[PDB]
Amino acid sequence: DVAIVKEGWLHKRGEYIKTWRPRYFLLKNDGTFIGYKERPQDEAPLNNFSVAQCQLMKTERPRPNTFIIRCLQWTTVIERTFHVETPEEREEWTTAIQTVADGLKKRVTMNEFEYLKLLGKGTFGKVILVKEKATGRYYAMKILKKEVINSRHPFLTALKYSFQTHDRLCFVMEYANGGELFFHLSRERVFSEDRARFYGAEIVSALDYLHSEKNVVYRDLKLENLMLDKDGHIKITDFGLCKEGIKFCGTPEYLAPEVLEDNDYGRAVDWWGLGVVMYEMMCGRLPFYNQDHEKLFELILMEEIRFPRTLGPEAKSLLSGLLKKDPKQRLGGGSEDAKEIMQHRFFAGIVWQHVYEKKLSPPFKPQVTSETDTRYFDEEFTA
Numbered sequence: 001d002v003a004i005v006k007e008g009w010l011h012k013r014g015e016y017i018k019t020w021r022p023r024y025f026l027l028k029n030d031g032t033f034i035g036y037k038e039r040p041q042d043e044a045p046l047n048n049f050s051v052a053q054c055q056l057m058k059t060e061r062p063r064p065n066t067f068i069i070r071c072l073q074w075t076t077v078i079e080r081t082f083h084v085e086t087p088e089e090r091e092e093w094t095t096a097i098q099t100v101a102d103g104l105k106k107r108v109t110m111n112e113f114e115y116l117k118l119l120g121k122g123t124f125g126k127v128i129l130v131k132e133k134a135t136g137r138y139y140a141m142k143i144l145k146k147e148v149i150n151s152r153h154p155f156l157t158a159l160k161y162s163f164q165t166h167d168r169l170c171f172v173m174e175y176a177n178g179g180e181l182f183f184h185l186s187r188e189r190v191f192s193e194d195r196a197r198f199y200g201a202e203i204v205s206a207l208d209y210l211h212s213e214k215n216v217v218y219r220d221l222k223l224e225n226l227m228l229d230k231d232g233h234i235k236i237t238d239f240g241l242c243k244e245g246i247k248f249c250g251t252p253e254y255l256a257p258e259v260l261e262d263n264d265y266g267r268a269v270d271w272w273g274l275g276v277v278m279y280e281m282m283c284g285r286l287p288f289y290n291q292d293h294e295k296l297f298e299l300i301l302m303e304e305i306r307f308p309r310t311l312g313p314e315a316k317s318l319l320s321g322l323l324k325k326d327p328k329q330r331l332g333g334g335s336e337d338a339k340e341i342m343q344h345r346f347f348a349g350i351v352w353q354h355v356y357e358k359k360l361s362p363p364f365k366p367q368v369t370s371e372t373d374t375r376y377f378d379e380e381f382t383a
């Protein structure tokens, strides 16, 4: 039943380097809209690429004959921006896309929270750190412009409340109080292989759930998006917002090659991210770094990952598999997805059900007495 509805060449604005690039796109009747560097030869679809419930806008800026697909995916507004040669072409694409979307169709208030800190500002909203007044618990509140618009896992930040104001949509997410992983790593310089295995196993369990139950690629796996809860278990965060980049969106050192290249991508992107995070945990340094962005892009796309003489053979095997440039050769990039990593000898002896059930005790216990303990927000202790 799944068929191609429309296909052809488009100019897509790049997601991280914001330049125009020719990509061959397939629109299919299951909602997927996916672009390739070349016309493909041709498996559960990924929501990332779905046009279901998206809004189509035609614009003449920055460039004439542009059209934008804007979607709310979980709690983040994403935009994909396209150009074609003629307005007649644009009309053909937008009506095809809109027809596909259509065919898919078939009290807490702000007064309850104390504002603490601005965490982030984006094009369509902001994210603030808040404390619920009645419990003293900490939350990240995503506050999105209404016009432009929770299955629990132990290691994902839970969406706790959602509500709207007259012109905003608010998403209230649990905020781990066990400290940022970048803070713990920099304090300790480097983690043992055992400690990295513990955190890596929890991330794998969370990514397996996202890929296989929710059919979504996280795409943002980086050390900055990892926190510890009060007991020392991992929380992958959902605090992001789309930004217009700085004159390039954000920072490149964590991005998978195929994402950097605005190529087709899939679940393998998250295994690259797992490799970047685990490489830094066990080596104490990012895998690729250079002040020059041109040099950094070429490092990520072309330079062979090097390892310290410190690293064991199991860890080198894991990291070199996770950091393969070609996602088709990358560990976890085959149809078994996460099971390829769960079965790797680096994780030998890990009982994966005990990972999910938190039966393995964290190697490091953050210095807090409860979920309301402010230690990792106290300026004095954060240095």
Ligand SMILES: CCC(=O)Nc1ccc2[nH]c(=O)n(C3CCN(Cc4ccc(-c5ncc(C(=O)NC)cc5-c5ccccc5)cc4)CC3)c2c1
Binding pocket: 015, 048, 073, 074, 075, 076, 078, 079, 150, 151, 156, 157, 158, 210, 214, 216, 217, 218, 219, 220, 236, 237, 238, 240, 241, 242, 243, 244, 245, 248, 249, 250, 251
């Ligand atoms: C430089 C500044 C900028 O604008 N960057 C940019 C540009 C284009 C983008 N396109 C694009 O998808 N993302 C983002 C990439 C990272 N995802 C990040 C992302 C991806 C998926 C989820 C997510 N999904 C569904 C569920 C669920 O339970 N379903 C029932 C749960 C989660 C979840 C994941 C972890 C923790 C908690 C919740 C959450 C966050 C969000 C989208 C883009 C980012």
